[PDB]
Design a protein around this nucleic acid. Structure first.
Lengths: 202, 197, 202, 197
DNA sequence: ATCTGACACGTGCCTGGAGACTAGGGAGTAATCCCCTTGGCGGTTAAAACGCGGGGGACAGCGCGTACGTGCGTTTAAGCGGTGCTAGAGCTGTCTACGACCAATTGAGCGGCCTCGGCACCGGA
DNA sequence: TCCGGTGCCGAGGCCGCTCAATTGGTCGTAGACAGCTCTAGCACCGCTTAAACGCACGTACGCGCTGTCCCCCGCGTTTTAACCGCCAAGGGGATTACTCCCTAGTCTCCAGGCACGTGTCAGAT
């Protein structure tokens, strides 16, 4: 009856999904899966960049989020991600100079352009937030989701499944150390194992 | 030691089911009392947090958001289904452990079927209403006896089961470092000792 | 040259210290030790009570902090502490009805009566804070500090040392499981061990 | 494995000093390279966090507050002395390990003197300027080569030493669970595996 | 029995803290509707509860294999002072760039309902 | 053992509501840059010495082997409630509606805390 309250994910997640994998679809439960993973990543990185880094009440900066992602993401993955972050910075510069701007969100591939202001500002570490930081978050979460989702879709094709299943996400995360170390700390459906390797007597 | 043991504890078969789910190849006959104890312990901590939360809320029943904020207070990144979550039945059967098709009992790991079949199960493994009985009973013994939402209850299911699986995984790591196959209870207490101590 | 900036601890810590142990004195380094332990405890419990418990933007309540301490503190220790909390509530009720009030801080044994508003309000989990909650914090931190400090002074007498040493605090914390589980997670001078017991082959 | 090994590493005697400080009764001859590696690793993480912090600060030198916020970003509750912190010399002597007074070498633990004497030392155990050389060298290899404050440097000392002691303590727990006395390197990597993995 | 130095104590200064008063909204309470929990009946069935064979798992005594613990001598540099340079750490100033806040606009997202085909079960080759 | 026929409920598709996201606008404000002061970090020297590293001896420690016994795991059968589905009921969850209590904002008063300097005993030898 009543309209929704939480952070908008559905379309944006299935948005850009086809370009990641056109043949492959999603499970609604897996969609909520990825949704809360995304908002968790937003919470953690927002908390880092905001609550931790700027001394005093200083504005939260795009560069702040940049560094936050760089540390939070893996060495190589963080390095690649931050370059992509600056790429998104340039893209949104082109957006803002454009009159069209964010009305069609100007290639801001995920709805993250909309969820970013939320995850930062109402994280309430401070009140003082640059929009560039929001674009940085959008890019960071969007790259992370793109990589994990692509791995998941590849797993689904490996399982020959039209729509993704949560086990595919599980396998993807446990497969990549980089993503796991970021988000595998969390809990989710099923056992949630790490699948320790080399079952050999030490 | 230090194993809280209440007066209602989910059957031991469920415990070894959890064990093999985590990939425990074999467990000592004493491995099961402690794991019951510490699953009770995690449950108790979580329910205390959530219930004091709702008590602050001037509330009379636990809902999903309650245990949600409680768990992330426990510092666990948490979320579960509000519409249709995985239940219990739903699972790979116990008597279909035999394999006429692709016979089990070969080595590498020897069983090779039970563990795979049970791990490939989305469903929650602990019977729902036995767990519900624990929830109500603990809300008796400390909780001021309030109502429970099955949605919050089941997300609690997933939180506690996955957490204890992580525990058992650490325990298996311990055992292999101890260079032996079967897991002992002592292994589990050592795991928890490392976990908080 | 410039005057201090951080949270005031020195006098309040040595305040009420004599009634805890008159013969025994403090080390300045141990004094800063206990100071930051106190402010950490304030941060953690404030974060719990504020950031976690009240749904929505609801005021932070004295009862909120009460429950926060109850969970954060041990079973028995928390139960005793919360009763002491209500005792402090009554004491500050007597304070507020008194015209004298907090001008002499009316038996608010630690300076915690002054640091409490800081550790809550500028923790910035919200803006909406009841003063009763502040008194609750004052009591909680004050009981915790009193217990740990008394154990430390007893250790110093056991070491026959006029002024406390940091090793005494270390031994006190590792000695009491209740206090350790609260604060032993943190780091401090020296090795900071937990001193695992029963060195016997398992 | 996965042991980062730089081109400047604090002497091995300091490593076994840390070990016995944590209460290591005895260590395999290979135990020391990995502990050097992972102390380097913790150092590297901390310095990266702090240095990127100061780089945000449009700053050119690390001060205490820098590594402070960096460490509590690492999620460690941290604080140290701005006026006069414990240094190095300051310590119980190495040659006074003998005890003419209360002779060592008796059992329960056998040494009974070195470990107690070293644990009862407030002072930092790693030589300050070797550590300073590591700090500067790493600020070379990644850090953009900026100045260091000895106060922040020494609070970094205490953070890293205590953290690695906690590591070694977990490792000793592991060893005893493995039912054997001397600690191995493999034990240390297992400890770190449990720590993050 | 002595010495170093940490600190207890004396002098001087002002910001941290408290109280009166106010604005005002944030909060608590109360009423109502029905949604959703809680309990109960009935049924199946499947898992809990349990034992036997066995075969492998765990380890006591023991030595195999060795290299680490202990102990001593030398060389390196660690500590620590001493001097000097200046980079730079912090504080204050101006100039303004930028992101809140208000209000209006647009169509994307999503609830709810209907369509159906991907997907599970099973018989034939 | 594998492939194709059988069948369903779940996923995709569609309609419509409205409010999320956007836009421009202003304000004022946070902050970024410039400039000054002088601390301390850094470099270098140089000395002391403690430590580190290298070298020796021996035996203490890892652990696997037989060899013992010794225990859960496979298989089974026996037992009852777990699940599930439906019905009843009402507790209470959310929502709207009404009242007033609570602290922040401001100012003012005040004192106990801050630094800085001098002599003495706490603690290590």
């Amino acid at each position: 009856r009543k309209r929704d309250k939480s952070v908008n994910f559905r379309l944006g997640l299935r948005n850009m999904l086809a370009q990641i994998h056109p043949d492959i679809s999603v499970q609604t439960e897996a969609l909520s899966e990825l949704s809360n993973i995304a908002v968790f990543l937003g919470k953690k990185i927002s908390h880092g960049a905001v609550t931790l880094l700027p001394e005093g009440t200083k504005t939260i900066k795009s560069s702040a989020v940049l560094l936050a992602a760089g540390d939070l993401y893996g060495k190589d993955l963080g390095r690649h991600a931050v370059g992509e972050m600056t790429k998104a910075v340039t893209r949104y510069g082109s957006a803002k100079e454009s009159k069209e701007g964010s009305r069609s969100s100007k290639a801001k591939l995920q709805i993250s352009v909309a969820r970013s202001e939320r995850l930062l500002r109402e994280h309430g570490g401070c009140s003082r937030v640059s929009e560039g930081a929001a674009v940085a978050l959008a890019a960071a979460i969007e790259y992370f989701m793109g990589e994990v989702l692509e791995l998941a879709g590849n797993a689904a094709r490996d399982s020959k499944k039209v729509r993704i299943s949560v086990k595919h996400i599980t396998l993807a995360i446990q497969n990549d150390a980089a993503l796991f170390a970021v988000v595998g700390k969390g809990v989710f459906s099923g056992a949630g194992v790490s699948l320790i390797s080399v079952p050999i007597p030490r | 030691d230090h194993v809280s043991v209440g007066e209602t504890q989910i059957p031991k078969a469920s415990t070894q089911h959890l064990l093999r789910k985590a990939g425990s190849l074999s467990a000592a006959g004493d491995t099961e009392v402690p794991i019951r104890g510490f699953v009770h312990m995690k449950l108790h901590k979580l329910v205390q947090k959530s219930l004091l939360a709702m008590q602050l809320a001037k509330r009379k029943t636990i809902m999903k958001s309650d245990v949600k904020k409680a768990a992330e207070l426990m510092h666990l990144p948490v979320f579960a289904i509000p519409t249709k979550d995985s239940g219990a039945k739903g699972s790979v059967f116990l008597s279909c452990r035999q394999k006429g098709a692709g016979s089990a009992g070969t080595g590498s790991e020897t069983n090779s079927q039970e563990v795979r079949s049970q791990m490939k199960s989305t469903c929650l493994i602990i019977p729902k209403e036995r767990f519900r009985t624990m929830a109500k009973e603990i809300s008796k013994k400390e909780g001021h006896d309030v109502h429970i939402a099955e949605a919050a209850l089941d997300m609690l299911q997933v939180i506690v089961e996955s957490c204890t699986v992580r525990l058992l995984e650490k325990a298996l790591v311990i055992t292999y470092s101890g260079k032996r196959t079967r897991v002992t209870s002592k292994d589990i207490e050592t795991a928890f000792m490392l976990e908080h101590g």
